[PDB]
Amino acid sequence: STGSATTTPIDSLDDAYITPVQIGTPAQTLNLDFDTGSSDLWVFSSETTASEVDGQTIYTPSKSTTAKLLSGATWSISYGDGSSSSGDVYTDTVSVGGLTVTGQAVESAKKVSSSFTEDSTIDGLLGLAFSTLNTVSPTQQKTFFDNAKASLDSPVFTADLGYHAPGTYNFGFIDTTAYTGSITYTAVSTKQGFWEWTSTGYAVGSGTFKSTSIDGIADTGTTLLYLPATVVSAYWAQVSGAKSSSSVGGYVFPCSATLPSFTFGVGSARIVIPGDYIDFGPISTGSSSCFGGIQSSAGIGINIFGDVALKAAFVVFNGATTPTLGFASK
Numbered sequence: 140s141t142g143s144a145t146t147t148p149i150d151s152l153d154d155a156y157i158t159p160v161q162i163g164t165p166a167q168t169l170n171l172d173f174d175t176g177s178s179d180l181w182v183f184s185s186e187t188t189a190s191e192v193d194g195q196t197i198y199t200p201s202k203s204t205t206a207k208l209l210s211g212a213t214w215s216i217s218y219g220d221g222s223s224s225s226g227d228v229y230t231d232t233v234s235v236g237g238l239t240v241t242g243q244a245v246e247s248a249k250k251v252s253s254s255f256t257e258d259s260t261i262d263g264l265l266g267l268a269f270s271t272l273n274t275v276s277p278t279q280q281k282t283f284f285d286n287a288k289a290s291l292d293s294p295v296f297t298a299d300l301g302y303h304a305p306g307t308y309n310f311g312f313i314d315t316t317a318y319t320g321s322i323t324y325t326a327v328s329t330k331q332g333f334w335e336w337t338s339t340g341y342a343v344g345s346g347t348f349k350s351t352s353i354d355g356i357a358d359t360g361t362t363l364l365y366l367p368a369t370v371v372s373a374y375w376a377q378v379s380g381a382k383s384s385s386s387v388g389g390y391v392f393p394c395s396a397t398l399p400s401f402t403f404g405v406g407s408a409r410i411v412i413p414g415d416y417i418d419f420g421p422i423s424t425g426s427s428s429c430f431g432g433i434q435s436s437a438g439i440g441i442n443i444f445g446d447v448a449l450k451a452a453f454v455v456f457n458g459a460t461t462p463t464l465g466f467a468s469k
């Protein structure tokens with residue numbers, strides 16, 4: 140079997156991408172943020188604290204004839220940005236673009252942090268990292284992909300994120316019309332539960348390629364590209380007026396600048412991120428200081444190939460016995 144669903148940026152900056160997901164019987168459609176950086180499928184629900192819901196679509200397990208309370212199960216998760224959520228668990232039928240998983244753990248939120256309440260467009264998250272990161276206690280639960288894997292035509296999912304445009308999440312098949320050239324596959328370490336891999340280096344604009352190993356995660360749930368301070372300083376040194384600002388919390392640059400591209404290595408292959416992808420607009424409404432899409436990973440403790448990098452490529456998350464990542468230009 141296969142699945143195919145369109146993913147759409149939540150706003151004009153591509154801060155995040157939402158993908159419609161059907162939960163329960165009759166179907167309840169919620170727009171979830173597909174996140175390869177986490178492994179919990181959680182949703183705003185009829186159990187979420189009323190003052191913490193502001194425009195989100197909720198899942199009401201009492202209206203689903205297939206919903207079952209997963210007795211005694213709770214979940215609690217904290218994300219890299221400081222956001223968090225927690226609640227109880229139901230099992231229910233969940234489908235993504237035609238692909239159905241019966242008995243999928245649907246973590247119903249009882250509490251959500253302010254960042255989630257403020258994002259009226261995001262009804263929850265659908266984790267796609269390894270199930271080892273799943274927070275359901277006392278019985279750890281599998282991701283949607285892990286549960287669908289055996290039934291898929293090929294044990295893969297692909298991320299084809301658009302730049303200020305819709306894109307596609309495919310499950311179980313590789314669309315050979317969605318990319319140019321060939322897909323370059325690279326090794327993955329699952330030791331930290333992420334799609335963790337090693338980039339072979341970088342270039343800034345038309346500069347010479349620097350061969351250097353950059354360990355990092357392919358994370359659809361992270362907006363920006365977080366790389367080592369050396370790499371990020373080399374990039375921003377090419378933009379007149381660019382600087383790191385502690386008051387803003389990162390590199391900012393004059394909104395009047397035309398940014399250089401950023402190339403990242405995938406084995407002997409190169410993925411070019413166009414300069415316009417690196418512009419995250421004014422730091423505040425009406426400001427002439429723009430926020431950079433390439434930031435330092437120094438405070439995080441891991442490099443993150445977020446949406447800025449992933450949207451420049453057709454990306455294969457190969458969940459075979461030996462998992463790999465494939466990258467192709469598009």
Ligand SMILES: NCc1ccc(C(F)(F)F)cc1
Pocket residue numbers: 155172174176177218219220222254255258261360361
């Ligand atoms: N990396 C996961 C993630 C995704 C979205 C959000 C936000 F911004 F919607 F709250 C936080 C954390």
